[PDB]
Amino acid sequence: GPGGTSVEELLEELRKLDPRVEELVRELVRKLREEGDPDKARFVADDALHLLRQGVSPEEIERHLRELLK
Amino acid sequence: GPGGTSVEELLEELRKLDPRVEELVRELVRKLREEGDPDKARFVADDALHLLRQGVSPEEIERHLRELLK
Ligand SMILES: [Zn+2]
Ligand SMILES: [Zn+2]
Ligand SMILES: [Zn+2]
Ligand SMILES: [Zn+2]
């Protein structure tokens, strides 16, 4: 459905905290949209923002996101 | 795909921290599985666990999860 949190807003907030995490998440978002799941893309970006706000390293963020994508 | 983080493990961890949040998440998980998106259910449970570990109130958790479900 339309509406809800903006994936672009989430990506924006990631960029302000760590562009390295924004870059890895933007790539996952692009692939997930191509597989036809924008909501999954939004969950991934939202999750990365929670973890980055708590000081999780980019590599640990990526590992965590991959497990939710299996 | 099979594998990845267990939704039951997440629900278990929610219950240990606040059974009120486990209960509201279990209901969302049941509905999301019925709509044929178990991965969405798992994202919701994982998100609730991050927020509950940070001290977010059950009502604020529910509001946040709903916005990701729009
Ligand atoms: Zn929607
Ligand atoms: Zn969230
Ligand atoms: Zn899977
Ligand atoms: Zn997570």
Side-chain angles (χ1 to χ4, degrees), chain B residues 4 6 8-10 12 14 16-17 21 24-26 28 31 40-43 45-46 48 51 64-65:
Chain B
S6 167
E8 284 300 323
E9 175 49 44
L10 294 168
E12 195 24 54
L14 291 170
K16 289 198 289 173
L17 289 170
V21 175
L24 81 92
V25 168
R26 188 174 288 279
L28 283 176
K31 155 199 145 123
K40 190 168 278 194
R42 176 166 63 184
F43 275 117
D46 178 75
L51 293 193
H64 178 73
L65 297 175

Side-chain angles (χ1 to χ4, degrees), chain A residues 31-32 35 37 40 66-70, chain B residues 1-7 36-40 42-43:
Chain A
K31 155 199 145 123
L32 287 165
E35 304 175 355
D37 204 336
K40 190 168 278 194
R66 292 280 174 183
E67 293 299 308
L68 299 167
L69 292 175
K70 295 207 199 313
Chain B
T5 306
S6 167
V7 71
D37 204 336
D39 277 357
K40 190 168 278 194
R42 176 166 63 184
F43 275 117

Side-chain angles (χ1 to χ4, degrees), chain A residues 1-5 10 37 39-40 42-44 46-47 50-51 53-54 64-65 67-70, chain B residues 1-5 10 37 39-40 42-44 46-47 50-51 53-54 64-65 67-70:
Chain A
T5 306
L10 294 168
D37 204 336
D39 277 357
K40 190 168 278 194
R42 176 166 63 184
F43 275 117
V44 167
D46 178 75
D47 214 52
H50 295 314
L51 293 193
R53 285 183 168 158
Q54 305 168 296
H64 178 73
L65 297 175
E67 293 299 308
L68 299 167
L69 292 175
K70 295 207 199 313
Chain B
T5 306
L10 294 168
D37 204 336
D39 277 357
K40 190 168 278 194
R42 176 166 63 184
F43 275 117
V44 167
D46 178 75
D47 214 52
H50 295 314
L51 293 193
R53 285 183 168 158
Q54 305 168 296
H64 178 73
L65 297 175
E67 293 299 308
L68 299 167
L69 292 175
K70 295 207 199 313

Side-chain angles (χ1 to χ4, degrees), chain A residues 10-27:
Chain A
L10 294 168
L11 288 168
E12 195 24 54
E13 294 300 319
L14 291 170
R15 193 169 38 80
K16 289 198 289 173
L17 289 170
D18 194 340
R20 295 168 195 196
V21 175
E22 189 252 18
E23 170 184 71
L24 81 92
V25 168
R26 188 174 288 279
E27 191 46 38

